[PDB]
Amino acid sequence: QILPIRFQEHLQLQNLGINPANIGFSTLTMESDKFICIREKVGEQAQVVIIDMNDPSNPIRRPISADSAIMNPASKVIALKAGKTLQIFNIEMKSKMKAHTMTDDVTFWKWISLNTVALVTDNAVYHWSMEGESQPVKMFDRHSSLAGCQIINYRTDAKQKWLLLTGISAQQNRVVGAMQLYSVDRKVSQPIEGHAASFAQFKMEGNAEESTLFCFAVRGQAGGKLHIIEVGTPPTGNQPFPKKAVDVFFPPEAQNDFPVAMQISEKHDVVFLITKYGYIHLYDLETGTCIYMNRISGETIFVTAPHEATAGIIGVNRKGQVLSVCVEEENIIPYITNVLQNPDLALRMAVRNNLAGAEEL
């Protein structure tokens, strides 16, 4: 059978001398497909291990006293913290670029762009530009709906006008997602039940300007749902993007499963969704139509990034497998025509994203 996606194993971190005890959410970071950082204690000495994905054979270990390390998405620039102490280093320059002392512990942080670090404290969210003498600026106060959640993600639209904070907690013996969507222009927060989310830019045919889309997936008691919604006033002259809501299927033996990660391909206009217990889903961004579901593994993929090369998703599982999934550009249109029997979707996707196979419907 032809599959509309392709899997690829890039690395086993245990073949690089990474101890499996350090392959987890709190100790391994992958902020982009260019680097993986792992904090390890070897003897008495805390180290950071930096894997250059363009040179994976030669990890470099450096001593640290940081509780958290996140590499810049594009440059060998690393953000380190220990409690309230934040430091930015250019590794190649062996130089401290910037430092700041917070008045609150940072419980979650990540790079939201090439030049900005987002910081989450117990009660607020900050952006920290690496430009000039910029210090962290508060973006919004955390909503009470996320109080006592484990913060697992933070994302923004391209223009940093829509901000989304995601926490989870145990309620009624399931993992319940609490999201806060903040409008920077309107200064309004919306609490939303959700597990995974991304923003995307999408130009509707007949529109001169891109639409800003907010895509989120949730397992409620209502069952699995994926939502694709335009945020903000449509650009002048644009038609509005019509809201989509579709089902997210969980089989009977995965009654405890829930979405953990989402990446949107702007090349293919598809949504990749990964569940906690190793299901992969592919949805059309325009309509929400489910294209494909299958099981990767039992294994939790606990961190993901965009895979630039393939317009796909790359992740690491608890075994230390670095795995990517992308659209199979040669099979997806035949797969949608023949296996899904959806010649409409097939033909739309074939001309929208310039793919082969809708000559033969």
């Binding site: 950071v48 940081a66 062996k94 002392t101």
Partner: peptide, 8 residues
């Protein structure tokens, strides 16, 4: 406040 990383 000391460097949180040590180089060569």
């Amino acid at each position: 406040s000391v460097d949180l990383i040590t180089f060569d």
